[PDB]
Scaffold this active site. Structure first.
Site, PDB file in Angstrom:
ATOM      1  N   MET A   1      -3.622  14.774  -9.895  1.00  0.00           N
ATOM      2  CA  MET A   1      -4.671  14.931  -8.904  1.00  0.00           C
ATOM      3  C   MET A   1      -5.280  13.596  -8.537  1.00  0.00           C
ATOM      4  O   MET A   1      -5.335  12.681  -9.351  1.00  0.00           O
ATOM      5  CB  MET A   1      -5.797  15.802  -9.426  1.00  0.00           C
ATOM      6  CG  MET A   1      -5.384  17.132  -9.921  1.00  0.00           C
ATOM      7  SD  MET A   1      -6.802  17.973 -10.573  1.00  0.00           S
ATOM      8  CE  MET A   1      -7.907  17.728  -9.202  1.00  0.00           C
ATOM      9  N   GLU A   2      -5.798  13.533  -7.316  1.00  0.00           N
ATOM     10  CA  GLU A   2      -6.516  12.388  -6.759  1.00  0.00           C
ATOM     11  C   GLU A   2      -5.713  11.087  -6.853  1.00  0.00           C
ATOM     12  O   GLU A   2      -6.132  10.121  -7.483  1.00  0.00           O
ATOM     13  CB  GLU A   2      -7.892  12.258  -7.416  1.00  0.00           C
ATOM     14  CG  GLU A   2      -8.920  11.527  -6.575  1.00  0.00           C
ATOM     15  CD  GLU A   2     -10.315  11.644  -7.133  1.00  0.00           C
ATOM     16  OE1 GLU A   2     -10.688  12.748  -7.565  1.00  0.00           O
ATOM     17  OE2 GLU A   2     -11.057  10.648  -7.113  1.00  0.00           O
ATOM     18  N   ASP A   3      -4.505  11.121  -6.284  1.00  0.00           N
ATOM     19  CA  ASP A   3      -3.583   9.988  -6.174  1.00  0.00           C
ATOM     20  C   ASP A   3      -3.007   9.463  -7.467  1.00  0.00           C
ATOM     21  O   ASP A   3      -3.319   8.355  -7.893  1.00  0.00           O
ATOM     22  CB  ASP A   3      -4.188   8.827  -5.408  1.00  0.00           C
ATOM     23  CG  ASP A   3      -4.636   9.236  -4.068  1.00  0.00           C
ATOM     24  OD1 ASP A   3      -4.271  10.355  -3.665  1.00  0.00           O
ATOM     25  OD2 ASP A   3      -5.329   8.453  -3.393  1.00  0.00           O
ATOM     26  N   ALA A   4      -2.210  10.284  -8.115  1.00  0.00           N
ATOM     27  CA  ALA A   4      -1.461   9.902  -9.285  1.00  0.00           C
ATOM     28  C   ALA A   4      -0.090  10.476  -9.009  1.00  0.00           C
ATOM     29  O   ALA A   4       0.086  11.225  -8.057  1.00  0.00           O
ATOM     30  CB  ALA A   4      -2.080  10.393 -10.583  1.00  0.00           C
TER      31      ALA A   4
ATOM     32  N   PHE B   1      -8.264   6.590  -8.752  1.00  0.00           N
ATOM     33  CA  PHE B   1      -7.311   6.320  -9.813  1.00  0.00           C
ATOM     34  C   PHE B   1      -6.247   5.306  -9.440  1.00  0.00           C
ATOM     35  O   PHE B   1      -5.254   5.188 -10.157  1.00  0.00           O
ATOM     36  CB  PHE B   1      -6.675   7.613 -10.255  1.00  0.00           C
ATOM     37  CG  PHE B   1      -7.586   8.463 -11.056  1.00  0.00           C
ATOM     38  CD1 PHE B   1      -8.021   8.056 -12.290  1.00  0.00           C
ATOM     39  CD2 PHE B   1      -8.069   9.636 -10.539  1.00  0.00           C
ATOM     40  CE1 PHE B   1      -8.888   8.831 -13.011  1.00  0.00           C
ATOM     41  CE2 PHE B   1      -8.935  10.410 -11.256  1.00  0.00           C
ATOM     42  CZ  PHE B   1      -9.347  10.005 -12.489  1.00  0.00           C
TER      43      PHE B   1
END
Ligand SMILES: [Mg+2]
Ligand SMILES: [Zn+2]
Ligand SMILES: [Zn+2]
Lengths: 195, 49, 65, 901, 98, 49
Positions: free
Chosen positions: B3-6, D459
């Site tokens: 999630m959130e750009d991984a 991240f």
């Protein structure tokens, strides 16, 4: 000299009448050395203005007092441009338009570097030869300069001053960040960095 | 875990070659000559102090 | 906590629809620079506006307003 | 016996004091001299301070390392005016009368101004007004009440010279010069009773002491000798100027005492005055800076304590620290909301002292025996004496013998030590929070996903630092007061800050829609994935027609406690009548049967009654970073510790459905058929032709202009409104045709990286393109780009893109879009700059205020800023949307629990 | 160089007229002077400065008459890689590889 | 752009019909030709030149 057009001409007699009656001729020149240096320099008064007028007002047209007469005509034309805009004649030149913006690339910059460096050499070469005249006096006549020269150049001078100014990125004029170190990671970057 | 750009990467793919890369560095130890006449001399430092 | 809670949204002070589809209020200096003006004294401030309401005769009629 | 600093009372050093606090009279004007045996009898270690490897000092030995320097003095042959008090000396000199000592006021006048000194004893600002009125009233007078007025001349100033325009022949007004000796002898007459009537003190600051008679010499330790290359002693600035003082001083005493040609005394006096001025302040006014032979100005005392880069902000108020680490972060939603993952390499380079007592003796013996290599090892051991013994070298057995209680071992970080965590920039209050260490193999910090609104972290490589407090009082304090669970609600606004993000919300919708029947195998498998631990009550299988299976509502219901009654409309409603058909059956009954009309449910009216979700679907009105009125109510009603389990179990639940159910987005999700495409095309043609008609009206002078703006701006104002409608009209078509049952619109309507505005901007017009308000004007002399005709204010010419991101942008249109995109780039980096400075202002103005026990906010001078804090008395972290207690909620809550039974 | 031209000294006999500049080939003389050609790849690896000598001719004008122009080097000017005067110009692919 | 000396330029225009500054009124004379900002000469018809 400014313009023969009557409408533009009527806005200049006003300005003319207010000051040209108070200051006669060449006394304004006197006021420059007055206004520049506060404290009585009587002789120096005239001569300071000569320094200021010749070394500051439009130095691309000339540096001698004779060249003033040419800038005279030029200065009039520049002034004209301002006065018509207050009457409305043109449209303000936006300074981001690429017609009035020019790039000085690597060639022309290196000229400004080489000029100052070469100047320092010629000055150091003059002083040295003079300081070899009293202690050595007379040598062989036509081979006086032909030996005075080679002993009095010490070539390292011109060379060092070219490297150290280009390798540190602080030029003599006052500019900084002229030279960067070529970013070499992944081929596209280097090609991109060159532009 | 993405999630959130991984981004999740196949283990086998790493282990067969994908995206492997090598880093390089180089040191520049020289031999300074002091004006007094002494010099450096690269020798194995004698177990002293 | 009063300082921090007021200084945090200034970072998230993005744009709005500055060209609204409205008429009456125009160029009243919104945004973050407004906050700076009220936090400081400044006798002068840029673009003042004063609001006027009307009594019970002028409240519903165009020709009297 | 270990006192602390009560107060500080500033004042002025008296000459009397300087002689006792001095250790020796400095007399030899020289520095070291030279390359061997550096010991003189004047300015260097003549019982002053030690810097060389020679132990000699004032009897105490005490080598250069740790040896506080001692002061010296210089008996100045003549008095010298201190430059710093010059302006004040004027106020004293021309306000009193010479020979008497009175303040040139009658007793009566003096008597009554005494009563304004007790009523003002705290406010420095309003007493300065009252001093100057006395000042101004005394300067305009000539009649002393104790010398019969014999015509008082007026004083002069600026910069340090004084005069008095007296009379001596018959009417002359010569300017007699003033000498410091003259001035000094005139101030000692002013009695001690009058100093309060001026701006002085009788014991701490006598006026006569303002004329320097003895100059105190700073110690050796404050005057270090820096070396240049490797053999040059670049002497200290202080030392040089002091040496200069003694060289002129020594000639001074010998030159007046022997021969007296009078003239020398005049020149020599002012030079000493000049010279001392530089020692106090090299950047003074009217004083040529006394430099060293190199061009570099000397930085004396006023450039030492300050000079914008001295010793407050540089080394005192800010430092790098010890016991820290810094690296990248990557996510992992399988640990509890407050835990942090620490890479095992960092765990061995950071230790905590433990102080073995009697119950953990056994544990620590194994730790120190394990040495510095294995994970549960140790690095140091501290005996009661204080010498630290390092466990490395060759053995650790003989250390780990009888340990003998009272020692201290520094073990590696184990599971459970408290640690803080920082993002750096520390904007809001919440950016530093205490976590609980858990250790795993690899090299990143693992941070649980819902704790990534408060840090404002993402991240893509962002780095965080972690420091570990050590002393037992500090460590305890961190765990009770800063732990994550005490910060679910934010002090800025009354709402939850730590909550569900993107997948947490979207997955919650799929779990609770009409018809989400989960087979027996899956239910069983997922309750074991969410920590919860139930017995043999999955029961009872709502639908057994196809197969025995479970309705989605009951599985979600196994988390809420058994008494939560809540009901609220949410974002997904689209039919305001069907919400309202059910809205009356809750008011006039309060407890109906669930079967009748609650089973005639809607998908947008959350109804929970006594622990059972009858109707409704969960979206961003339950969880989420902005307002969610479910997580909100569960933290007020049922402490703090319950909320973290409900939050934690919701996360791992919701994730398991989204993963196994499939949630992709393809390329056909943005496609519209041929008929809908033609529908948009006719809209763009009419909207263009409307703009053309207005331009033709402007040319023929039938304008009909708006009130305020000028004609040229009225045209632009009308145009922008015409096109903004047309873009939004196309957007209504996009929200109409493509259904709500594809995997892309779902994300938009719930609130998980969504905006209906960008889904429409991918299959319809982009719209106009603006730059800070006006339309595109910046270009060539008469046009924007060189591909249009000069003098075209049309829709297509002045920057209006017609094609979408799917169908593709043309060359003109693509360039226009770049002009609008650079706007967002520039701004975001600029807005931060003004914010950061602005915050520094308000912090350094309000940090002093505290709330006293009687509920009163007082500034540090006892000036009461607010009787009963914040218009009493509820803390913003616990108040309900600006209000307080909320009678409307409390009534329904207690009345339902009692009536329901 | 055409701006400076003639200059001083205070002794009225001598003068120095500035002639023409020619730009040589990249070479370097190390310790105990031995002029050997330089290539770019070798220069970056041993900390040298890739440059070329600048030769000026100076004309001793004694009492007005010219008698003997002398060409004397002045130092070293950094030459740009793959420019015109640097040895890598118009060289074939196989020779660059070698 | 590379660069071209001002010599060959000036002559070629002048030889072709550029009327020197010695003749101007100028306004209103259908005139003003410029060379890098330096006002040198005038012409007769704009579109022609
Ligand atoms: Mg980031
Ligand atoms: Zn001591
Ligand atoms: Zn008196």
């Amino acid at each position: 000299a400014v313009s023969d057009d009557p409408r533009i001409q009527q806005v200049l007699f006003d300005n003319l009448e207010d000051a040209s009656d108070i200051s006669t001729q060449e006394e304004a020149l006197d006021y420059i050395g007055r206004l520049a240096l506060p404290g009585q320099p009587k002789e120096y008064r005239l001569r300071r203005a000569e320094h200021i007028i010749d070394n500051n007002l439009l130095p691309h047209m000339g540096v001698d007092p004779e060249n003033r007469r040419a800038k005279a005509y030029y200065l009039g034309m520049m002034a004209l441009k301002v006065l018509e805009l207050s009457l409305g004649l043109r449209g303000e030149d936006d300074k981001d338009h690429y017609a009035n913006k020019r790039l000085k690339l690597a060639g022309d910059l290196l000229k400004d570097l080489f000029r100052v460096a070469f100047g320092q050499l010629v000055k150091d070469m003059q002083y040295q030869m003079t300081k070899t005249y009293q202690r050595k006096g007379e040598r062989y006549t036509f081979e006086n300069i032909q030996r005075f020269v080679r002993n009095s150049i010490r070539p390292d001078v011109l060379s060092e001053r070219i490297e150290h100014a280009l390798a540190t990125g602080s030029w003599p004029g006052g500019r900084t960040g002229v030279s960067q170190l070529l970013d070499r990671t992944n081929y596209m970057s280097t090609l991109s960095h060159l532009r | 875990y993405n999630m959130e750009d991984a981004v999740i990467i196949n283990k086998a793919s790493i282990e067969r070659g994908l995206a492997r890369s090598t880093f390089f560095r180089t040191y520049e130890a020289e031999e300074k000559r002091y004006l007094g006449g002494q010099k450096d001399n690269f020798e194995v430092p004698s177990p002293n102090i | 906590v009063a300082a921090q809670s007021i200084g945090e949204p200034s970072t998230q002070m993005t744009l709005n629809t500055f060209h609204y589809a409205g008429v009456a209020e125009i160029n009243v200096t919104l945004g973050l620079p407004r906050i700076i003006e009220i936090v400081d004294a400044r006798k002068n401030p840029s673009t003042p506006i004063m609001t006027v309401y009307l009594d019970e005769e002028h409240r519903y009629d165009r020709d009297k307003a | 016996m270990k006192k602390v600093i009560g107060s500080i009372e500033f004042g002025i050093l008296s000459p009397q004091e300087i002689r006792k606090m001095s250790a020796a009279e400095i007399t030899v004007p020289d520095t070291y001299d030279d390359d061997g045996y550096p010991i003189e009898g004047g300015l260097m270690d003549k019982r002053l301070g030690v810097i060389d490897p020679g132990l000699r000092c004032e009897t105490c030995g005490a080598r250069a390392g740790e040896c506080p320097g001692h002061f010296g003095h210089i008996e100045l042959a003549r008095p010298v005016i201190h430059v710093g008090f010059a302006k004040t000396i004027h106020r004293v000199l021309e306000s009193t009368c010479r020979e008497c000592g009175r303040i040139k006021l009658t007793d009566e006048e003096i008597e009554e101004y005494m009563q304004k000194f007790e009523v003002m004893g705290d406010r420095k600002g309003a007493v300065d007004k009252l001093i100057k009125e006395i000042h101004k009233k005394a300067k305009e007078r000539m009649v002393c009440p104790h010398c019969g007025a014999p015509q008082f001349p007026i004083k002069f100033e600026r910069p340090t010279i004084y005069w008095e325009l007296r009379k001596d022949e018959e009417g002359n007004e010569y300017k007699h010069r003033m000498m410091p000796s003259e001035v000094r002898d005139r101030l000692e007459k002013i009695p001690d009773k009058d100093l309060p009537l001026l701006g002085l003190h009788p014991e701490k600051s006598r006026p006569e002491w303002m004329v320097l008679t003895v100059l105190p010499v700073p110690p050796v330790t404050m005057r270090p000798s820096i070396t240049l290359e490797s053999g040059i002693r670049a002497e200290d600035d202080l030392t040089h100027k002091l040496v200069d003082i003694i060289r002129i001083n020594n000639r001074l005493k010998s030159n007046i005492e022997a021969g007296a040609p009078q003239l020398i005394i005049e020149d020599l006096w002012d030079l000493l005055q000049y010279h001392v001025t530089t020692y106090i302040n090299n950047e003074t006014s009217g004083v040529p800076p006394a430099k060293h032979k190199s061009g570099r100005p000397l930085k004396t005392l006023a450039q030492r304590l300050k000079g914008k880069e001295g010793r407050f902000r540089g080394n005192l108020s800010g430092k790098r620290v010890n016991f820290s680490a810094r690296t990248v972060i990557s996510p992992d939603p399988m640990i509890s909301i407050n835990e942090v993952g620490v890479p095992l390499a960092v765990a061995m380079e950071l230790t905590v002292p433990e102080k073995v007592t009697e119950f953990n003796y056994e544990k620590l013996k194994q730790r120190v025996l394990n040495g510095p290599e294995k994970y549960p090892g140790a690095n140091y051991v501290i005996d009661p004496e204080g010498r630290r013994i390092r466990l490395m070298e060759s053995n650790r057995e003989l250390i780990a013998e009888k340990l003998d209680i009272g020692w201290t071992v520094e073990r590696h970080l184990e599971d459970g030590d408290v640690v803080l965590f920082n993002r750096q920039p520390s904007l809001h209050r919440m950016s530093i929070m205490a976590h609980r260490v858990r250790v795993m193999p690899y090299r990143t910090f693992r941070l649980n996903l819902p704790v990534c609104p408060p840090y404002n972290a993402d991240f893509d490589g962002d780095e965080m630092n972690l420091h570990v407090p050590q002393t037992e009082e500090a460590q305890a304090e961190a765990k009770i007061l800063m732990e994550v669970q005490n910060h679910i609600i934010s002090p800025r606004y009354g709402g939850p800050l730590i909550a569900g993000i993107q997948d947490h919300i979207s997955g919650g919708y799929l779990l609770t829609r009409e018809g989400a029947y989960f087979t027996r195998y899956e239910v069983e498998q997922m309750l074991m994935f969410a920590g919860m631990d139930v017995n043999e009550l999955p029961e009872p299988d709502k639908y057994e027609n196809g197969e025995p299976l479970w309705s989605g509502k009951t599985i979600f219901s196994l988390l809420l406690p058994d008494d939560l009654t809540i009901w609220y409309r949410n974002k997904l409603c689209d039919e305001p009548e069907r919400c309202e058909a059910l809205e009356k059956l809750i008011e006039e009954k309060l407890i109906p049967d669930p079967e009748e009309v609650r089973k005639l449910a809607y998908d947008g009216f959350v109804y929970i009654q006594n622990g059972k979700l009858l109707s409704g679907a969960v979206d961003k009105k339950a969880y989420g970073r902005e307002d969610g009125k479910l997580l909100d109510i569960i933290v007020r009603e049922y402490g703090v510790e319950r909320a973290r389990q409900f939050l934690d179990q919701v996360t791992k639940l919701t994730i398991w459905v989204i993963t196994h159910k499939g949630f992709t987005t393809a390329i056909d999700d943005e496609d519209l058929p041929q008929e809908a495409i033609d529908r948009i095309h006719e809209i763009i043609r009419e909207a263009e032709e409307k703009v053309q008609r207005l331009i033709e009206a402007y040319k023929r002078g039938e304008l009909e202009p708006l009130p305020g703006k000028t004609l040229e701006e009225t045209l632009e104002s009308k145009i922008m409104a015409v096109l903004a409608e047309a873009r939004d009209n196309a957007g209504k078509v996009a929200e109409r045709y493509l259904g709500m049952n594809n995997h892309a619109v779902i994300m938009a309507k719930t609130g998980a990286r969504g905006k209906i505005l960008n889904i429409t901007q991918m299959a319809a017009m982009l719209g106009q393109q603006s730059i800070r308000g006006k339309r595109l004007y910046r270009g060539y002399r008469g046009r924007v780009l060189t591909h249009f005709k000069p003098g075209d204010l049309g829709a297509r010419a002045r920057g209006f893109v017609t094609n979408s991101y799917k169908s593709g942008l043309t060359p003109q249109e693509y360039f226009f879009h770049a002009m609008g995109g650079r706007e967002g780039l520039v701004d975001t980096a600029v807005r931060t700059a003004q914010s950061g400075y602005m915050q520094r202002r308000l912090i350094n103005a309000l940090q002093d205020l505290k709330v006293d026990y009687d509920g009163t906010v007082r500034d540090p001078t006892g000036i009461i800023v607010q009787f009963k804090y914040g218009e009493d008395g509820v803390d913003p972290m616990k108040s309900w949307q600006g209000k307080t207690v909320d009678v409307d909620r409390v009534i329904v809550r207690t009345l339902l629990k009692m009536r329901g039974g | 160089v055409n701006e400076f031209g003639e200059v001083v000294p205070d002794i009225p006999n001598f003068k120095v007229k500035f002639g023409k500049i020619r730009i040589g080939q990249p070479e370097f003389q190390e310790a105990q002077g031995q002029r050997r050609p330089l290539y770019p790849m070798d220069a970056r690896i041993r900390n040298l400065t890739y440059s070329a000598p600048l030769y000026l001719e100076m004309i001793p004008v004694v009492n007005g008459i010219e008698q003997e122009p002398v060409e004397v080097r002045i130092g070293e000017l950094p030459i740009m890689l793959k420019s015109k005067a640097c040895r890598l110009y118009g060289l074939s692919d196989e020779e660059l590889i070698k | 752009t590379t660069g071209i000396p001002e010599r060959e330029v000036r002559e070629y225009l002048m030889k072709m019909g550029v009327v020197p500054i010695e003749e101007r009124r100028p306004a209103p004379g259908l005139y003003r030709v410029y060379l890098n900002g330096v006002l040198i000469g005038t012409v007769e018809d704009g579109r022609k030149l």
